[PDB]
């Protein structure tokens, strides 16, 4: 009897002919963890699917690309019922034969059942609630799900082959739950902090940075234009450079009245690009917001104010437009990255030499016993470190401002238009740390036990790393990969305890 | 602490989920504990409307019908 109820509390009887102890009724309830039914994971669900995801920049923020075939199988009952509701099929069987035949008329029946009918999209690491979002389906040839770029951040979804799952909201309450709660457009803000999670990601923000930027002398410098309309007319036709300092008449709005939009017009000192971009900015936002260089931080604060001022609808439609225009102008820019785009300081080799004398100095002090071994070590490590800072802030100065150009005079100097700098400055991708590894020397790596090798990597990636330098680089990589691969699981555990306690 | 505080939950179906099942079932079965649902974990197990969000209207309307004329 004991073995039947709960096995393992006495002898652990073993099943017939099989060494493994037979599972008893208590073991049927139990598991990992607690119950199997609802624990991760947790029941399979009908009307569902999944596949590789791709980009789809054409989408509006409220929709997503859905493969024709996926949609056919998903909505099969909807298709069957609509087919004989309109009388295209005698009976359900004949309808089945119709979609099984894929008769041409059925695709149109599917456009009816899809139109207003959100589908749920999900990704692997469902962490916060933004992990599931509703979209309006758009029928797409091909087997890949297309996902609006602006959402890729909330999902933490790359395009490197990540797959996403689709779910159909069958019941009416679910359709309306999807549209009014989980819809893409209705959650634009992170629940962790009110900052917008729809912030433009990389190509788009590089577009706006290249758009609103100004060089010192460019075609059309000094002229004046009536309004953004004729600014674009000037640019697209090839008369004026995208970035040139120009005064143009603009009309801004301020809602500073009591629920009422004030208007004011003036001659603003600006560039051509910022002028064109103004066409997108809705209503009550001031022109002050676009007159700057528009980095990734500012371009977010743009959206936030737009939300806190005009409300939701204007912010959404605003967001869509920024993406479309960001991608578009960035493509025109022809930004690229060459090998001659990474500029090594001319003084690098000299800094290394100077930093190299200190180490041979401290060594001489240790040979004569003037300084202890540990004190020696710390010294050498410090000078090399100081050297790294020196080279970094060397290549940073050279790289940043070195564009030296002429307006009507001899010279002047502005922020460089060099490709890789624009990337790092705008906030798109790359950072001062990583740039430092490209051009200036990269670091002093660390041996597995946690100590730091006193002979740094004097080279960088634009130059070659020799055998040793690479090998020393390896430990750092391996601890990185290992830490993330284990620490990924750990994060989940924390949320678990938390949601259980709340 | 969080892991300790999550231990106490009135509803036993919730507790049989994340705690040790055997112990929860016994220790509850002797006292004849009557689980009223009212929680999230338990309503999900049994498969009805969550007592929050869209469901909050439901549970509210039922909770008042209960222990009432």
């Amino acid at each position: 009897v004991d073995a039947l109820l709960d096995n393992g509390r006495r002898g652990r009887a073993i099943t017939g002919s099989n060494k493994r102890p037979l599972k008893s009724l208590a073991d049927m309830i139990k598991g990992k963890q607690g119950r199997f039914r609802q624990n991760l994971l947790g029941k399979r669900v009908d009307y569902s699917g999944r596949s590789v995801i791709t980009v789809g920049p054409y989408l509006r923020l409220h929709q997503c690309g859905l493969p024709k075939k996926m949609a056919l199988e998903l909505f099969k009952p909807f298709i069957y019922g609509k087919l004989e509701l309109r009388g295209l099929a005698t009976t359900i069987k004949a309808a089945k034969k119709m979609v099984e035949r894929e008769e041409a008329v059925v695709w149109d029946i599917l456009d009816e059942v899809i139109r207003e009918h959100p589908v749920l999209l999900n990704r692997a690491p469902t962490l916060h609630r933004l992990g599931i979002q509703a979209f309006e389906p758009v029928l797409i040839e091909g087997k890949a799900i297309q996902l609006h770029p602006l959402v890729c951040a909330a999902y933490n979804a790359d395009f490197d082959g990540d797959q996403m799952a689709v779910h159909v909201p069958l019941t009416l309450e679910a359709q309306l739950e999807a549209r009014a709660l989980m819809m893409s457009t209705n959650n634009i803000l992170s629940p962790a902090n009110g900052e917008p999670i729809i912030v433009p990601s990389q190509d788009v923000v590089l577009g706006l940075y290249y758009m609103t930027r100004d060089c010192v002398n460019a075609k059309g410098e000094g002229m004046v234009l009536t309004g953004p309309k004729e600014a674009e007319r000037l640019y697209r036709s090839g008369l004026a450079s995208l970035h040139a300092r120009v005064k143009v008449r603009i009309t801004e709005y301020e809602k500073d009245a009591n629920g009422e939009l004030v208007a004011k017009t003036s001659l603003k000192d600006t560039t051509v690009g910022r002028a064109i971009l103004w066409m997108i900015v809705p209503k009550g936002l001031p022109y002050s917001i676009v007159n700057q260089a528009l980095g990734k931080k500012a371009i977010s604060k743009m959206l936030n104010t737009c939300y806190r001022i005009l409300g939701l609808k204007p912010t959404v439609i605003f967001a869509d437009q920024i993406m479309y225009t960001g991608f578009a102008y960035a493509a025109r820019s022809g930004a690229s990255v060459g090998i001659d785009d990474m500029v090594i300081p001319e003084k690098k080799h000299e800094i290394i030499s100077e930093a190299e004398a200190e180490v041979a100095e401290i060594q001489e002090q240790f040979q004569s016993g003037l300084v202890t071994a540990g004190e020696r070590y710390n010294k050498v490590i410090d000078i090399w470190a100081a050297a790294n800072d020196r080279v970094s802030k060397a290549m940073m100065d050279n790289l940043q401002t070195e564009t030296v150009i002429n307006r009507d005079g001899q010279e002047e100097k502005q922020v460089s238009f060099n490709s890789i700098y624009m990337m790092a400055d705008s906030g798109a991708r790359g950072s001062a740390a990583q740039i430092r590894q490209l051009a200036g020397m990269r670091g002093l790596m660390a041996k597995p036990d946690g100590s730091i090798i006193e002979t740094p990597i004097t080279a960088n990636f634009r130059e070659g790393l020799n055998v040793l330098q690479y090998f020393i680089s390896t430990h750092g990589a391996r601890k990185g990969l290992a830490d993330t691969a284990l620490k990924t699981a750990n994060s989940g555990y924390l949320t678990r305890r938390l949601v259980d306690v709340a | 602490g969080i892991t300790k505080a999550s231990l106490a939950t009135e509803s036993f179906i919730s507790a049989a989920s994340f705690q040790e099942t055997t112990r929860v079932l016994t220790e509850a079965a002797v006292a004849g504990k009557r689980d009223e649902l009212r929680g999230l974990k338990e309503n999900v197990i049994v498969g009805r409307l969550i007592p929050a969000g869209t469901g909050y209207a439901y549970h509210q309307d039922r909770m008042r019908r209960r222990a009432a004329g």
Binding site: K487, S491, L494, R497, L498 | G1, I2
Partner: peptide, 22 residues
């Protein structure tokens, strides 16, 4: 100390190793 495990310790209330007294 610090890091993600530091957070878990905080929410777990664990009394530190060499605590002070009030």
């Amino acid at each position: 100390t610090g890091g993600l495990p530091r957070v878990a310790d905080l929410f777990e209330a664990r009394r530190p190793k060499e605590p002070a007294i009030l």
